[PDB]
Amino acid sequence: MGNPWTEYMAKYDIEEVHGSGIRVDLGEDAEVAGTQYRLPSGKCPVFGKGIIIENSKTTFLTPVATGNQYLKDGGFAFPPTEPLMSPMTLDEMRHFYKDNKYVKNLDELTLCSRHAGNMIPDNDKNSNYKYPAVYDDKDKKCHILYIAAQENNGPRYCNSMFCFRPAKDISFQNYVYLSKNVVDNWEKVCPRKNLQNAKFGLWVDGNCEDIPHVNEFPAIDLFECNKLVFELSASDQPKQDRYKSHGKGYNWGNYNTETQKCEIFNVKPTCLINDKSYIATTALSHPIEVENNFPSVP
Amino acid sequence: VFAEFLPLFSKFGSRMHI
Amino acid sequence: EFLPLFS
């Protein structure tokens, strides 16, 4: 028979809806004054993602250090400008874009992405380079990230360039990592909340079958399972169309709350199985928020 | 040619006015 | 170092 889950499961086809790396998103190239740079290009927001700077006095949302201290000290965020472009609260962005009907009423995540995307590096009128952003969903503030790099942790170097890695840390729970490509309609086409009493499956001959091969990792709670899925997810950087994942990777997990097992897999799921012991998560999903009821499929 | 890190620039533009 | 914005 025909699959009734099609429309519902569309947001879980990560390769199609996001289409780039999750752990490290560097799915496009852009130019600044003749030089090419790799930059984020995922279409979905990444809930709970931040950057851990190894052996640092501050967090990544601290502005970049200046002059020769750039990339040694400070954080990743845009330095103070005249007028101040970053950080910008939700209210300040809506006021700043008040003359633009296409931007002023965008949802907060899309607005933060468009605001970051308005900054031209070096005022190079030919540049297509668009800074990513971090939205703090608790304080309702948009932080433009000056640094688009997400991982620098080779055993080699890790006074000199700082070492860092992407992560879903408990302190990043209200942060949302945004590429320049974050879609207007993310709420309808992208994952956010984890699915309580649901297990991802594969639709075969009129029935939702279990994922036939999973990679089992132990996890004390849902947050730790989401951290694990994130760590193993699509990455546009080899861990420490060149290295472009295009959204391919271990982006899905079925968390068994009873056996404390995070069952990680790398193919798109095509249906849901109602199972009281499970929570269905993705690398993109919020690390804590759950959708309380199993969906009613017509 | 590609570079790993973007230089810290002194000035910036705005696309906001289309 | 303070950065200005231009149109």
Author numbering:
A (entry chain A): 106 to 263, 271 to 352, 388 to 445
B (entry chain C): 1 to 18
C (entry chain D): 4 to 10
Paper text:
The formation of a moving junction (MJ) between the membranes of the parasite and its host cell is essential for invasion. Two important components of the MJ are Apical Membrane Antigen 1 (AMA1) on the parasite surface and the Plasmodium rhoptry neck (RON) protein complex that is translocated to the erythrocyte membrane during invasion. The extra-cellular region of RON2, a component of this complex, interacts with AMA1, providing a bridge between the parasite and its host cell that is crucial for successful invasion. Here, we report the crystal structure of the complex formed between PfAMA1 and peptide segments of PfRON2, which, together with our previous structural results on the TgAMA1-TgRON2 co-structure, highlights a conserved, crucial interaction in apicomplexan host cell invasion.
